[PDB]
Design a protein around this motif. Structure first.
Motif, PDB file in Angstrom:
ATOM      1  N   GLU A  26       0.827  -1.201   0.000  1.00 21.30           N
ATOM      2  CA  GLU A  26       0.000   0.000   0.000  1.00 21.30           C
ATOM      3  C   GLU A  26       0.866   1.257   0.000  1.00 21.30           C
ATOM      4  O   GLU A  26       0.592   2.213   0.725  1.00 21.30           O
ATOM      5  CB  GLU A  26      -0.929   0.004   1.216  1.00 21.30           C
ATOM      6  N   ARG A  92     -12.986   0.213  -4.274  1.00 22.29           N
ATOM      7  CA  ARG A  92     -11.591   0.170  -3.854  1.00 22.29           C
ATOM      8  C   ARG A  92     -11.417   0.908  -2.532  1.00 22.29           C
ATOM      9  O   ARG A  92     -10.980   2.059  -2.504  1.00 22.29           O
ATOM     10  CB  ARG A  92     -10.687   0.791  -4.924  1.00 22.29           C
ATOM     11  N   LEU A  94     -10.413   2.831   0.459  1.00 25.60           N
ATOM     12  CA  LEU A  94      -9.216   3.635   0.689  1.00 25.60           C
ATOM     13  C   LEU A  94      -8.962   3.785   2.183  1.00 25.60           C
ATOM     14  O   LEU A  94      -9.813   4.289   2.917  1.00 25.60           O
ATOM     15  CB  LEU A  94      -9.353   5.024   0.057  1.00 25.60           C
ATOM     16  N   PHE A 114      -1.077   4.885   2.076  1.00 26.41           N
ATOM     17  CA  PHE A 114      -1.971   5.349   1.020  1.00 26.41           C
ATOM     18  C   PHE A 114      -2.314   4.216   0.056  1.00 26.41           C
ATOM     19  O   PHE A 114      -1.474   3.369  -0.246  1.00 26.41           O
ATOM     20  CB  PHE A 114      -1.329   6.510   0.257  1.00 26.41           C
ATOM     21  N   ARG A 115      -3.554   4.210  -0.423  1.00 31.54           N
ATOM     22  CA  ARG A 115      -4.010   3.184  -1.355  1.00 31.54           C
ATOM     23  C   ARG A 115      -4.555   3.817  -2.632  1.00 31.54           C
ATOM     24  O   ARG A 115      -5.690   4.295  -2.664  1.00 31.54           O
ATOM     25  CB  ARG A 115      -5.084   2.313  -0.699  1.00 31.54           C
ATOM     26  N   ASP A 116      -3.740   3.819  -3.682  1.00 29.76           N
ATOM     27  CA  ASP A 116      -4.140   4.396  -4.960  1.00 29.76           C
ATOM     28  C   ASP A 116      -3.916   3.405  -6.098  1.00 29.76           C
ATOM     29  O   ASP A 116      -2.812   2.894  -6.282  1.00 29.76           O
ATOM     30  CB  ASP A 116      -3.362   5.686  -5.227  1.00 29.76           C
ATOM     31  N   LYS A 117      -4.972   3.138  -6.860  1.00 28.02           N
ATOM     32  CA  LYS A 117      -4.890   2.210  -7.981  1.00 28.02           C
ATOM     33  C   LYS A 117      -4.600   2.953  -9.282  1.00 28.02           C
ATOM     34  O   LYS A 117      -5.453   3.673  -9.800  1.00 28.02           O
ATOM     35  CB  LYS A 117      -6.194   1.419  -8.111  1.00 28.02           C
ATOM     36  N   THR A 118      -3.391   2.774  -9.802  1.00 25.08           N
ATOM     37  CA  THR A 118      -2.988   3.428 -11.041  1.00 25.08           C
ATOM     38  C   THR A 118      -2.004   2.565 -11.823  1.00 25.08           C
ATOM     39  O   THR A 118      -1.203   1.853 -11.182  1.00 25.08           O
ATOM     40  CB  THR A 118      -2.346   4.801 -10.767  1.00 25.08           C
TER      41      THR A 118
END
Length: 118
Positions: A26, A92, A94, A114-118
């Motif tokens: 994460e 998703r 967060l 931090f949890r960012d899907k990219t």
């Protein structure tokens, strides 16, 4: 029901390889005390992969503000874990939380989750 699966025997670690490989991942970012984002990990950069100066900043936003903020600081102040929250933009969840590195007493600095899907 039960047809045939020989590999199921020799492939005992296979099921573990998928679980162990999963992990959290994460994002690994350290924030001196507050949310001072001026240092990124070599692994954290691999995720985004864009710039060396941009990766440094442009982080920490979904911190969520509240009245009893002192209760949150207690988590970092003491070497105690932290719980994650589900703020999901599109299925998703967060979870933006700041946890302190494990130690045997006084602990300084804080990590930004931090949890960012990219």
């Amino acid at each position: 029901g039960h047809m045939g699966l020989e590999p199921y025997e020799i492939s005992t670690l296979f099921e573990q390889r998928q679980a162990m490989l999963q992990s959290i991942k994460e994002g690994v970012v350290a924030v001196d005390d507050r949310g001072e984002v001026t240092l990124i990990n070599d692994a954290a950069q691999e995720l985004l992969n864009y710039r060396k100066s941009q990766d440094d900043e442009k982080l920490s936003t979904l911190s969520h503000s509240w009245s009893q903020v002192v209760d949150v600081s207690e988590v970092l102040r003491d070497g105690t874990p932290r719980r994650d929250e589900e703020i999901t933009i599109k299925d998703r969840l967060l979870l933006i939380n700041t946890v302190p590195v494990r130690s045997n007493g006084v602990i300084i600095g804080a990590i930004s989750t931090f949890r960012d899907k990219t």
